[PDB]
Amino acid sequence: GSHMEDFVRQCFNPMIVELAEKAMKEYGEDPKIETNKFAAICTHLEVCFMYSDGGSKHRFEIIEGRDRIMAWTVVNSICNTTGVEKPKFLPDLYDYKENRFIEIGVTRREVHIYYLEKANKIKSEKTHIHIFSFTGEEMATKADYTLDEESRARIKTRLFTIRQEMASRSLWDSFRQSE
């Protein structure tokens, strides 16, 4: 039983903890052992949820936090009714306003390097990429950051609070050196 597993359960809300547990178990991993990944998946989930809450009412369809099959089911319905091309890989959101899938990224390295890796992996020009760092920087496709500045600032505040809360527990260095 790790110090980091208890921190995650105290830091994130129960709905997010459970979806993250279900995400890892779906791919045969265990949150009690891969505790840094546990924390990262929770962090990514919370960012996705704040992001979809950042726009107007019906703006975003949330793809993240679903089982593999339902996630691809919703992608197929979105494509077969928008005409947008079907992404090679599962994204995190769909933007009904801008009519594009979004891939959210949270990294403990430089947004530049992480953004390059995901762009090269995606190859799909269509899917919009939006990277957030734990230091308060971001990088989005075509310099288009989708949400207004206040909603993005709130995300960056939360990320920095997570970072200090791990620091106060000496979990931060180990978390940084895992990615």
Ligand X SMILES: C[C@@H](N1CN([C@H]2c3ccccc3CSc3ccccc32)n2ccc(=O)c(O)c2C1=O)C(F)(F)F
**Enzyme catalytic residues:** 118
Question: Cβ-count burial of 124 within 10 angstroms (0-12 exposed, 13-18 middle, 19+ buried)?
Answer: middle
Q: Which residues bind ligand X (CB under 6 A)?
A: 23-24, 27, 29, 37, 40-41, 44, 64, 89-90, 92, 104-105
Cβ closer to ligand X: 118 or 154? 118
138 labeled part of a ligand binding site: no
Angle at the Cα of 5 (from 37 to 48), degrees rounded to 5? 50
Cβ closer to Mg ion: 118 or 169? 118
Question: Cβ-count burial of 168 within 10 angstroms (0-12 exposed, 13-18 middle, 19+ buried)?
Answer: exposed
The distance of closest approach from Cβ of residue 38 to ligand X in the complex, given in angstroms and rounded to an integer, is 9
Return the residue nearest ligand X (CB atom): 44
Q: Which residues bind Mg ion (CB under 5 A)?
A: 64, 92, 104
What, of ligand X, Mg ion, none, does residue 41 touch, CB below 5 to 8 Å by kind?
A: ligand X
Q: Which two tokens stand for residue 85?
A: 């091309």
Other C-beta atoms within 10 Å of 83: how many?
Answer: 8
Cβ closer to ligand X: 16 or 23? 23
44 labeled part of a ligand binding site: yes
How far CA 111 is from CA of 12, 31, 74, 133, 153, in Å, comes to: 24, 26, 29, 6, 16
Which residues define the annotated binding site for Mn(2+)? 44, 64, 92, 103-104
